[PDB]
Amino acid sequence: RIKTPEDISWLRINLQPMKTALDARVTRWIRVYTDFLVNQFRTTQKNLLDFIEKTKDGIKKNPADHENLHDKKLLMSVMKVISDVKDVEPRREGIITRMKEMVTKLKKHNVPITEKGTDDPLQQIDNANSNFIEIYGRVFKVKAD
């Protein structure tokens, strides 16, 4: 709004070209805040996806060795589950906050689809973790002796 129309003060002055340059710089500064988790969401999903992959392995009993490697993930899921839930509330707000002061839609239908996808795997991971934890506890009690 602030650029305004050509103002005449003895010699006509045009800010038309200048206004476009300001818009370019303004969008770049706005883009950094909006794209803050744009890169981060993919990295968190890339990192988050690996945890689900370990869960997909599963398997009860069989070799003791595998248990030592798989057992660490449960210890990681507990800490990540507690800390991740606390970290989840601000992340939800960040996607919502940009939507309010950004008329344009980021990644179109994909960004909303991405949130629904994360929620379905997070719930699946929690149920898998509970079953894994009961099995882990019996084998770990033997491991503990």
Q: Which H helix or E strand runs over 13?
A: strand 11-13
Solved by what technique?
A: cryo-EM
In this structure, what DSSP letter does residue 12 have?
A: E
Q: Which H helix or E strand runs over 71?
A: helix 64-100
Phi, psi of 11 (to 5 degrees): -110, 125
Phi, psi of 58 (to 5 degrees): 60, -130
| CB-facing half-sphere around the CA of 7: CA atoms within 13 A | 5
Question: Collapsing DSSP states into helix, strand and coil, what is residue 15?
Answer: coil
| CB-facing half-sphere around the CA of 145: CA atoms within 13 A | 4
Both tokens of 15, joined, read 């800010």
